[PDB]
Design an enzyme around this catalytic site. Sequence first.
Site, PDB file in Angstrom:
ATOM      1  N   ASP A  50       1.244  -1.322  -0.158  1.00 45.09           N
ATOM      2  CA  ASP A  50       0.210   0.190  -0.254  1.00 45.09           C
ATOM      3  C   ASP A  50       1.156   1.589  -0.097  1.00 45.09           C
ATOM      4  OD1 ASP A  50      -3.410   0.353   0.965  1.00 45.09           O
ATOM      5  OD2 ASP A  50      -2.446   1.862   0.651  1.00 45.09           O
TER       6      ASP A  50
ATOM      7  N   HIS B  72      -3.825   6.283   3.432  1.00 46.24           N
ATOM      8  CA  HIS B  72      -3.802   5.356   2.940  1.00 46.24           C
ATOM      9  C   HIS B  72      -3.699   3.889   3.639  1.00 46.24           C
ATOM     10  CE1 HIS B  72      -5.326   1.887  -0.013  1.00 46.24           C
ATOM     11  NE2 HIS B  72      -6.883   2.382   0.255  1.00 46.24           N
TER      12      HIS B  72
ATOM     13  N   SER C  35     -11.089  -0.600  -0.119  1.00 44.42           N
ATOM     14  CA  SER C  35      -9.758  -0.577   0.916  1.00 44.42           C
ATOM     15  C   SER C  35      -9.914  -1.081   2.435  1.00 44.42           C
ATOM     16  CB  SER C  35      -9.470   0.242   0.160  1.00 44.42           C
ATOM     17  OG  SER C  35      -8.442   0.196  -0.805  1.00 44.42           O
TER      18      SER C  35
END
EC number: 3.4.21.14
Lengths: 433, 67
Positions: A30, A68, A254
């Site tokens: 990620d 994120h 996600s």
Amino acid sequence: NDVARGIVKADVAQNNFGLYGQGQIVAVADTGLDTGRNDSSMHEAFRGKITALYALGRTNNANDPNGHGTHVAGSVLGNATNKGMAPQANLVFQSIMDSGGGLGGLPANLQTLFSQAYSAGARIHTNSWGAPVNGAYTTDSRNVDDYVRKNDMTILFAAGNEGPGSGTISAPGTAKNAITVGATENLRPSFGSYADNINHVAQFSSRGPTRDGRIKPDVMAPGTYILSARSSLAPDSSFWANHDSKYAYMGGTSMATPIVAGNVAQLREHFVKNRGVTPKPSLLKAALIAGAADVGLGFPNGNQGWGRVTLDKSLNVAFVNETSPLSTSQKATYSFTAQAGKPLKISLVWSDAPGSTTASLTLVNDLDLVITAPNGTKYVGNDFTAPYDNNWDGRNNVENVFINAPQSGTYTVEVQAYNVPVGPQTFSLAIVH
Amino acid sequence: RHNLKTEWPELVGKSVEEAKKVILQDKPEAQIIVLPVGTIVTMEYRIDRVRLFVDKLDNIAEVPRVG
Ligand SMILES: [Ca+2]
Ligand SMILES: [Ca+2]
Ligand SMILES: [Ca+2]
């Protein structure tokens, strides 16, 4: 995370089975991870539990200005407050964000990404990303499938956020051998319609089938208003809402994916510690599928896949763990004792040979599940219309027989090798009753 | 009085500049991003974002949607 934990029964796994993921190593590929330094500067959720922190996208920089990746990794295994599902698992983090803001740190051949994580000790690998290619089976999907068949790595992908329309699954979420995760809602109703019913599929969640008509996603988890670790570099604009300087809210497939990745660490620990086996990727996936809950839309289904992860039902499935390789026209036959009065769910899953990116069907090796009830009634995998033995499945590498009101006595559970051009093909079975 | 609009199937094949005007007409707060078709992206849902995926002529290659 704290609300999702209860929804997926990670609290039951922890409180009643002692399963926090200790001894397991999950890799997350990620954006980046907080400060990007595996030292005392690291966010409390991960400090001291990082096996490896690799910078792939930006030379010597694994930090997370976006937020994120830090949020995602927090949901897998954060061990401060708002903990991940497997807070005693250790982390391998592959920072794939490039200097242009995208995910260009991903290698052209994804097997390279998986191999680096595997070498560091990860046996679970989770990926909250994808290309929104509407169900296509791309070279990336093929490389995931090839990798999983060759190595005992469980790989998870977000389904995509391109719904509610059918056929919107992202790649490599379209891979046959990945566990593909869609989003239901978390229950944080003060936030309104996106977090008000744990049975609701999030409106943005990508929907099956895949281009060749396979059922995706495989399973669901909460993916709206998830409260997890906030990167110290990330601005307010990266989050759905604030909470405090160390935790904030995000949503997407996600967010659902890492919840399930953590559940997989809990489940893998249980088999390894308490059931005497190293569970193969196919079995972990079959066990999650058999134990999953119908959110109310029924099966078969392109919105919920095989349902919402319910981890405590997955823990003590009766199973086969790739111990019978089959060639064409062979079969493996088993017995299972049922008692009337409660559901019977049987899932067959195999890690298939990699499919072609151009052919009509991606399935290569075709196994069939054939169940026989004590009174002789027959069921074949994925045939949910009566009579239940006339619609054979030749597209999916997940085949299910779900009987809500079974008979008392002996069920025959048979796996038939219809066609195995790239054999032999092993398989796993998971049975909930 | 804006109608709830979250996808623009009518913009497929149009220029990026034509697409942007329609999207802003429907969704004044849109934060629009342009990327090559097939690009791998993170899967968080941002309600004010609209990604436009374009072919090599800079025409919209697939249905733009919010997120
Ligand atoms: Ca709702
Ligand atoms: Ca079959
Ligand atoms: Ca039928």
